[PDB]
Design an enzyme around this catalytic site. Structure first.
Site, short mmCIF file in Angstrom:
data_model
loop_
_atom_site.label_atom_id
_atom_site.label_comp_id
_atom_site.label_asym_id
_atom_site.label_seq_id
_atom_site.Cartn_x
_atom_site.Cartn_y
_atom_site.Cartn_z
N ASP A 35 33.59 68.81 16.04
CA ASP A 35 33.62 69.35 17.42
C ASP A 35 32.41 69.35 17.61
O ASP A 35 31.13 69.57 17.35
CB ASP A 35 33.26 70.77 17.51
CG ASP A 35 33.15 72.37 18.72
OD1 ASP A 35 33.21 71.10 19.64
OD2 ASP A 35 32.84 73.03 18.47
N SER A 199 31.03 61.04 35.12
CA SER A 199 31.66 60.56 35.61
C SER A 199 31.86 60.16 36.77
O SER A 199 31.23 61.14 38.04
CB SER A 199 33.21 61.51 35.07
OG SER A 199 35.04 60.57 35.70
#
EC number: 3.4.23.22
Length: 330
Positions: A35, A199
């Site tokens: 994770d 992004s």
């Protein structure tokens, strides 16, 4: 040193991925959920409330000659999906894919929430976010990656998750045969303890690319792709009959649909998520309403590039003095 381990979807939907981890002496092999959005290595154990164990493999520290109680240390964690676990702490030897760390904090669960009990395939979590998020008290502990870093050939790990197939976590090296083209690196903020990046935009299907900054985290422990409501609405508007359902908890779509791809930007580069990766199947057995793999982050407080996005790429978690992320197509 290096390590390399195969990671395997837990079910036919890729709801999560499990990677075998050796703990203790002799080794006890547990299948952990790696994770990158959390920083605790915790396991089902001989200390876990018996009624909360349902098929998981447990770590038994009393059978490990290298286990030592970390005296006074406790831990307690809550995840973004509302699940939780807590317990006490041992140090022990932990190996992943041939890479060994001695003295790793292994957090032994005394209590786990129902969603962990109900998933017999996940024996615990191995956190790979930054150690500043580790919950052990009163002495915070380091992640497996942080402990191994100095010994690694290069201070990196990579995630290469498969679509409906196994993939690989590598530590200490970049497998140049595992991706196409070049790796595009992008800046990371560690201020929230996550692999947080920005992004450069997105496209839906064959549509034109929208240049827009989207701050979010690379999180292997989250199944889906969670993005701003504007972006998610633009995606699902291209699927006839798709709608946001308050009763189901997100966007659903007719199972008869063919889904468009979704592209996200990494610098000037582009990662394409095929439409099929966005199908999470019937909302309930036999239903013709299917659950979408792109959902709104509006209720979370952060955008999350979870497995849906990451499995479309070869992803480099670069833990150099100034961390960065790298993405390549594959």
């Amino acid at each position: 040193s290096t390590g390399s381990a195969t990671t395997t979807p837990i079910d036919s939907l890729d709801d999560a991925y499990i990677t075998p981890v050796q703990i203790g002496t002799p080794a006890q092999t547990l299948n952990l959920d790696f994770d990158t959005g959390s920083s605790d290595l915790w396991v089902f154990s001989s200390e876990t409330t018996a009624s909360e164990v349902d098929g998981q493999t447990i770590y038994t520290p009393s059978k490990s000659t290298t286990a030592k109680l970390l005296s006074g240390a406790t831990w307690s964690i809550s995840y973004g999906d509302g699940s939780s676990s807590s317990g006490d702490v041992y140090t022990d030897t932990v190996s992943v894919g041939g890479l060994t760390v001695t003295g790793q904090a292994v957090e032994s669960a005394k209590k786990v929430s129902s969603s962990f009990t109900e998933d017999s395939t996940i024996d615990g979590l191995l956190g790979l976010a930054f150690s500043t998020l580790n919950t052990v008290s009163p002495t915070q502990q380091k992640t497996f990656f942080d402990n191994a870093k100095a010994s690694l050939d290069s201070p990196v790990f990579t995630a290469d998750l498969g679509y409906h197939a196994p993939g690989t976590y590598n530590f200490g090296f970049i497998d140049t045969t595992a991706y196409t083209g070049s790796i595009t690196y992008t800046a990371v903020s560690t201020k929230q303890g996550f692999w947080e990046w920005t992004s450069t935009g997105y496209a839906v299907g064959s549509g034109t690319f929208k240049s827009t900054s989207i701050d979010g985290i690379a999180d292997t422990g989250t199944t889906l792709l969670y993005l701003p409501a504007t972006v998610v609405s633009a995606y699902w508007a291209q699927v006839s009959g798709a709608k946001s359902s308050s009763s189901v908890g997100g966007y659903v779509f007719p199972c008869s649909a063919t889904l468009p791809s979704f592209t996200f930007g990494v610098g000037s580069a582009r990662i394409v998520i095929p439409g099929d990766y966005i199908d999470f199947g019937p909302i309930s057995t036999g239903s013709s309403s299917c659950f979408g793999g792109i959902q709104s982050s509006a209720g979370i407080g952060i955008n999350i590039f979870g497995d849906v996005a990451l499995k479309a790429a070869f992803v480099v978690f670069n833990g150099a003095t100034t961390p960065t992320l790298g993405f390549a197509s594959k």
